[PDB]
């Protein structure tokens, strides 16, 4: 139980990675526009 | 409402402005972002048409 709770907590990193990648996608479209 | 597509990119806040149809986008706000919209494609035409005003060619 303690170890699964630890795994479940790190799932916060995944969506943070998720949001940042959204910004990287838009920012790259900008560079591509140049 | 505004244009048919006005929110391509990041930040759900611009997406909020879009889906909510806020009549205003503060300069102070839009300074804090990039590519506030990308009305760029190769398909169709928006919000206009041509072939009018018979004046000009007569000049």
d(CA B22, CA B30): 13
Residues of B in contact with A25 (CB under 8 A): 10
Q: A1-34 burial string, b = 16+ CB within 10 Å, else e?
A: eeeeeeeeeeeeeeeeeeeeeeeeebeeeeeeee
d(CA B1, CA B19): 9
CA nearest to A29, candidates B27, B3, B33, B10: B10
Per-residue tokens: A25: 């996608």
d(CA B30, CA A13): 28
- A5 to chain B, closest Cα gap in Å: 29
Per-residue tokens: B49: 């048409």
CA nearest to B22, candidates B36, B39, B41: B36
- B35 to chain A, closest Cα gap in Å: 8
Can you give chain B as a three-state secondary structure string? CCCCCCCCCCCHHHHHHHHHCCCCCCHHHHCCCCCCCCCCCCCCCCCCCCCCCCCHHHC
Give Dmax (Cα) for chain B.
50
Cβ of residue B35 closer than 8 Å to a chain A Cβ: yes
């Amino acid at each position: 139980e303690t170890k699964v709770d630890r795994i479940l907590s790190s799932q916060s990193l995944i969506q943070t990675i998720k949001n940042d990648i959204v910004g990287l996608k838009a920012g790259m479209a900008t560079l591509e526009g140049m | 409402v505004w244009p048919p597509l006005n929110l391509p990119g990041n930040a759900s806040k611009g997406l909020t402005e879009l889906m909510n149809d806020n009549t205003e986008i503060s300069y102070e706000f839009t300074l804090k972002h990039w590519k506030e919209v990308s009305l760029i494609k190769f398909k169709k035409c928006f919000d206009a048409d041509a072939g009018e005003e018979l004046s000009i060619f007569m000049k």
